[PDB]
Scaffold this active site. Sequence first.
Site, PDB file in Angstrom:
ATOM      1  N   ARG A 294       1.952   2.492   2.588  1.00  9.17           N
ATOM      2  CA  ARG A 294       1.435   1.628   1.677  1.00  9.17           C
ATOM      3  C   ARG A 294       2.103   0.045   1.733  1.00  9.17           C
ATOM      4  O   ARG A 294       1.727  -0.628   1.124  1.00  9.17           O
ATOM      5  CB  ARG A 294       1.881   2.053   0.301  1.00  9.17           C
TER       6      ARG A 294
ATOM      7  N   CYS B 115       0.832   8.438  -0.223  1.00  7.00           N
ATOM      8  CA  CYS B 115       0.431   7.572   1.140  1.00  7.00           C
ATOM      9  C   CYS B 115       1.797   7.062   1.534  1.00  7.00           C
ATOM     10  O   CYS B 115       2.514   5.793   1.075  1.00  7.00           O
ATOM     11  CB  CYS B 115      -0.745   6.642   0.874  1.00  7.00           C
TER      12      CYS B 115
HETATM   13  C1  HEM Z   1      -3.019   1.641   7.338  1.00  5.59           C
HETATM   14  C2  HEM Z   1      -2.121   2.519   7.692  1.00  5.59           C
HETATM   15  C3  HEM Z   1      -2.209   4.070   6.826  1.00  5.59           C
HETATM   16  C4  HEM Z   1      -1.251   5.073   7.320  1.00  5.59           C
HETATM   17  C5  HEM Z   1      -0.362   4.798   8.626  1.00  5.59           C
HETATM   18  C6  HEM Z   1      -1.647   6.045   6.219  1.00  5.59           C
HETATM   19  C7  HEM Z   1      -0.820   7.205   6.351  1.00  5.59           C
HETATM   20  C8  HEM Z   1      -1.074   8.199   5.466  1.00  5.59           C
HETATM   21  C9  HEM Z   1      -0.859   9.552   5.808  1.00  5.59           C
HETATM   22  C10 HEM Z   1      -0.055  10.209   6.766  1.00  5.59           C
HETATM   23  C11 HEM Z   1      -1.284  10.154   4.507  1.00  5.59           C
HETATM   24  C12 HEM Z   1      -1.166  11.635   4.131  1.00  5.59           C
HETATM   25  C13 HEM Z   1      -2.308  12.155   4.975  1.00  5.59           C
HETATM   26  C14 HEM Z   1      -2.291  13.864   5.216  1.00  5.59           C
HETATM   27  O1  HEM Z   1      -1.086  14.212   5.795  1.00  5.59           O
HETATM   28  O2  HEM Z   1      -3.419  14.377   4.773  1.00  5.59           O
HETATM   29  C15 HEM Z   1      -2.081   9.368   3.740  1.00  5.59           C
HETATM   30  C16 HEM Z   1      -2.561   9.600   2.383  1.00  5.59           C
HETATM   31  C17 HEM Z   1      -3.311   8.587   1.544  1.00  5.59           C
HETATM   32  N1  HEM Z   1      -3.730   7.312   1.955  1.00  5.59           N
HETATM   33 FE1  HEM Z   1      -2.849   6.307   3.576  1.00  5.59          FE
HETATM   34  N2  HEM Z   1      -2.390   5.602   5.374  1.00  5.59           N
HETATM   35  C18 HEM Z   1      -2.908   4.406   5.606  1.00  5.59           C
HETATM   36  C19 HEM Z   1      -3.937   3.613   5.122  1.00  5.59           C
HETATM   37  C20 HEM Z   1      -4.570   3.749   3.735  1.00  5.59           C
HETATM   38  C21 HEM Z   1      -5.449   3.008   3.266  1.00  5.59           C
HETATM   39  C22 HEM Z   1      -6.187   1.736   3.706  1.00  5.59           C
HETATM   40  C23 HEM Z   1      -5.805   3.522   1.842  1.00  5.59           C
HETATM   41  C24 HEM Z   1      -6.759   3.058   1.038  1.00  5.59           C
HETATM   42  C25 HEM Z   1      -7.371   1.995   0.902  1.00  5.59           C
HETATM   43  C26 HEM Z   1      -5.039   4.833   1.809  1.00  5.59           C
HETATM   44  C27 HEM Z   1      -5.149   5.754   0.756  1.00  5.59           C
HETATM   45  C28 HEM Z   1      -4.209   7.048   0.933  1.00  5.59           C
HETATM   46  C29 HEM Z   1      -4.716   8.016  -0.161  1.00  5.59           C
HETATM   47  C30 HEM Z   1      -5.301   7.840  -1.459  1.00  5.59           C
HETATM   48  C31 HEM Z   1      -3.874   8.943   0.385  1.00  5.59           C
HETATM   49  C32 HEM Z   1      -3.694  10.354  -0.327  1.00  5.59           C
HETATM   50  C33 HEM Z   1      -4.882  10.884  -1.091  1.00  5.59           C
HETATM   51  C34 HEM Z   1      -4.244  12.314  -1.814  1.00  5.59           C
HETATM   52  O3  HEM Z   1      -4.188  13.141  -1.112  1.00  5.59           O
HETATM   53  O4  HEM Z   1      -4.084  11.950  -3.168  1.00  5.59           O
HETATM   54  N3  HEM Z   1      -4.154   4.785   2.937  1.00  5.59           N
HETATM   55  N4  HEM Z   1      -1.723   8.172   4.197  1.00  5.59           N
END
Ligand code: HEM
Lengths: 419, 414
Positions: B115, B112
């Site tokens: 973060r 992510c």
């Molecule tokens: C607040 C703004 C956030 C942004 C800009 C963001 C951005 C991203 C992006 C671009 C990805 C890759 C997505 C993809 O290309 O498939 C990602 C993955 C992920 N995000 Fe974030 N995210 C945000 C919030 C969060 C939150 C609030 C959580 C959990 C409470 C979270 C948990 C995750 C997880 C677990 C993954 C990867 C899952 C995996 O494939 O292992 N994210 N995020």
Amino acid sequence: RFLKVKNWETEVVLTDTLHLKSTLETGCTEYICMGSIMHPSQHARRPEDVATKDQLFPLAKEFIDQYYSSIKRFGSKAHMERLEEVNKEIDTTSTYQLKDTELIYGAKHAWRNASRCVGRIQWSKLQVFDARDCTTAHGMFNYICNHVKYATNKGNLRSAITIFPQRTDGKHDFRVWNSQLIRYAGYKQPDGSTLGDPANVQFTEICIQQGWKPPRGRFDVLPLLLQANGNDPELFQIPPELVLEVPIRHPKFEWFKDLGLKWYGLPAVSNMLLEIGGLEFSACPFSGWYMGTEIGVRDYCDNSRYNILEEVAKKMNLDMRKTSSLWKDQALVEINIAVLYSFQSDKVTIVDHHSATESFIKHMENEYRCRGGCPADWVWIVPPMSGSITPVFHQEMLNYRLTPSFEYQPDPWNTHVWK
Amino acid sequence: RFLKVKNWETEVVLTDTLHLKSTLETGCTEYICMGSIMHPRPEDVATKDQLFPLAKEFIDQYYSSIKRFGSKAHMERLEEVNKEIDTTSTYQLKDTELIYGAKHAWRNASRCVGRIQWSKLQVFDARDCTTAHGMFNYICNHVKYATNKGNLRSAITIFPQRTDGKHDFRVWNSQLIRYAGYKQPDGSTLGDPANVQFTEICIQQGWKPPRGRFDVLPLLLQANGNDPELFQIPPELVLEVPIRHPKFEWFKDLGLKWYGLPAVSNMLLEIGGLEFSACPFSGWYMGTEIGVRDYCDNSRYNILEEVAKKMNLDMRKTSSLWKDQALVEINIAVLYSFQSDKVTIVDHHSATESFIKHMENEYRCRGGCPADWVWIVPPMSGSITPVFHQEMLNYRLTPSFEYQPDPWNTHVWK
Ligand code: HEM
Ligand code: HEM
Ligand SMILES: CNCCc1cc(F)c(F)c(OCc2cc(C)cc(N)n2)c1
Ligand SMILES: CNCCc1cc(F)c(F)c(OCc2cc(C)cc(N)n2)c1
Ligand SMILES: C[C@H](O)[C@H](O)[C@H]1CNc2nc(N)[nH]c(=O)c2N1
Ligand SMILES: C[C@H](O)[C@H](O)[C@H]1CNc2nc(N)[nH]c(=O)c2N1
Ligand SMILES: [Zn+2]
């Protein structure tokens, strides 16, 4: 045990057994992955300097075994005699010499094994120049000039490698001090800025410190700095008729040529080490042809390189007060259209990243089919722009270290004791 | 006992000690790297003896975070947990521990880029839910709170943990808001080709589909291992953004729009050996998620060709870079539209710059920051963002978000 890789765009699954033949550590463990580290491991196959017999011979036996297996012998009379020959040779000199056929096989398979190289579909089409009789920097310059002229081939570029004598004790190394055969100089300005190529500021200063008289321009082809049998390196100017250059213009923006930009046509990596059966060829310049992005994305747009993005954007009339206009992205695409259009117009071999990555997927298919696998490093194979619209972005890859191989080595000026 | 990572653009070097605390597998071996593999049983619920050390590690970690390690309350809490595991073969998190665990599963999410915001996460405790109607209610409130009229706020709703594996709560949707996909008899696809399979499951469960290009799917919710049930999110709670272009009059005529709220609902949240199989979480979009992947993946809406045509691009040869050119303009449009409508969004340059600042701070105060370069680097313009040049160490810390099997592959229908 037997590992599968999937493409998520096509659902093709491939099964990998070749990884069981890998010898050297990747750097990863079951607990940490080092796949984005530039130099993750120092696991070398032989110790510091001149190795004992029980160190070098087992490596030699492995490569000879692999070579004779490659040609459907193994155990043949020639194979068993070859083992005895290498054995006596290490006994009497502490090293051994490769037959012409083994040298060519080893060079081609180091290219084949190069997990970071997207161009490997041509791996078996490599011209090998045996330069192992070379004895002086002057001789190295002659071999390198012949290489450059053969590989340029008036624009119809040809893959080639030139192989200088192997390392003996470590004090008689042959080295090309340049990182690539053809690069532009970089000048540290008094007002703190930089003219030319900032990557080469330090090497440029070593050249000046050696007597090079810099023309102090933006595209000054650096001299060659060649080291033979461990002696001090010597400067040579590559004859300019041998350095093919492409002026960069744009098929719609007429104002593009007024940027005054050009690039060289021949990419020739000259600072890597070639490892074959425990032998170490510390000077082995190799060349092919450019993928467009190497010039137009990295060479021109990296912040610590030519960094022309602002200028191209300004000329394009782009809003440069906020990132979300994606002005960098817009200029970046136009530059790469320009690079590709210029090289193709002047009939200089070049490949765009769509064609190159598509060819690599096909190379993968072939390798799993005949060889049981293909080591590939996703972090390097995926192009540095438009990643997910190329087919490699969606392709899972296994990375592992096969020998023969190309390896990194320290820069000679950190190592060399002058005289 | 040290590991160093280098930035090749800035020369900055950081030192990772945090990786010593990792305990679960990357998938790599000492002789092969699986860094680009995307995914390296229901009765596999933990025994009493498996749960004891997992719970201890997490409680120890939690009391260390609040500067009460070894304290009286730390020792009695430990005792209380081990008692519950003896009696009931499981235990219950306190509310403080739940909030800490959910925050640190995000903090530990190596894939992510977003973060930098991990400590500002609103945690909705839905562990008292017993029915799918209850889950519908919890989820609607999550959507309304997180959407906040376009001023998006990150949030997670946590449903009851796994017990025996036969009573799992699941959101069957992969995200809370996705558009339906429909295969036509002529092989073409209406809507989002990604969701064709899930759209068919919904239709079969009784959903009457509008059969349009942008039908918000219904929620398919499973409580306590019972068959899942359908619910229609109230349309006033689904904020959407029509996509137009600031320079191209014709772009609006493509009829494109997207939802404002990215809300992943198919993952498993693991805290101290407890497994929360239903834990939807949400943030706000990075532009390229919609502009590059959603709209331009060949397996998705696949509008590169359509946009290139209206751009009068030479699409005979790849080396014209018509695909590249069309991709930038779409991503310009996505950002322009969200910003004009004051719906939170972040472009890939801003997002990746923030992540480098985050990563450096995490090295400062925590001893490292597990990061997956293959996912962190954006799917376009990679090397002109600062993360491309940043070395990163990938390792797995707990609490963590995990993948789990799709529920229709394992559910025992009643
Ligand atoms: C607040 C703004 C956030 C942004 C800009 C963001 C951005 C991203 C992006 C671009 C990805 C890759 C997505 C993809 O290309 O498939 C990602 C993955 C992920 N995000 Fe974030 N995210 C945000 C919030 C969060 C939150 C609030 C959580 C959990 C409470 C979270 C948990 C995750 C997880 C677990 C993954 C990867 C899952 C995996 O494939 O292992 N994210 N995020
Ligand atoms: C013929 C056309 C070729 C193309 C289009 C090509 C393409 C590439 C590219 C784009 C890279 C990544 C470079 C970067 O972005 O920094 C690379 C790496 C590499 N190439 Fe190729 N290449 C070609 C020929 C060759 C040949 C002839 C050899 C050796 C005989 C070779 C060996 C390697 C090696 C060893 C690396 C990685 C070295 C490292 O880790 O830095 N390539 N190639
Ligand atoms: C920041 N980038 C690092 C630059 C770099 C470093 C290496 F160590 C390479 F080996 C290399 O190879 C580039 C290459 C080689 C050949 C033969 C053809 C071609 N088209 N490109 C490039
Ligand atoms: C197309 N690639 C696969 C899609 C995908 C797979 C996952 F497993 C994710 F976790 C994910 O998360 C996307 C996301 C989540 C949040 C909370 C905010 C934000 N901006 N994006 C996306
Ligand atoms: C095979 C490869 O790992 C796969 O396509 C990955 C690459 N990197 C990614 N990165 C992000 N952010 N999202 C993705 O879905 C993917 N897909
Ligand atoms: C940190 C990261 O590993 C480093 O910047 C890598 C990433 N991928 C690359 N890929 C290619 N082709 N060439 C490179 O120099 C790099 N650099
Ligand atoms: Zn790895």
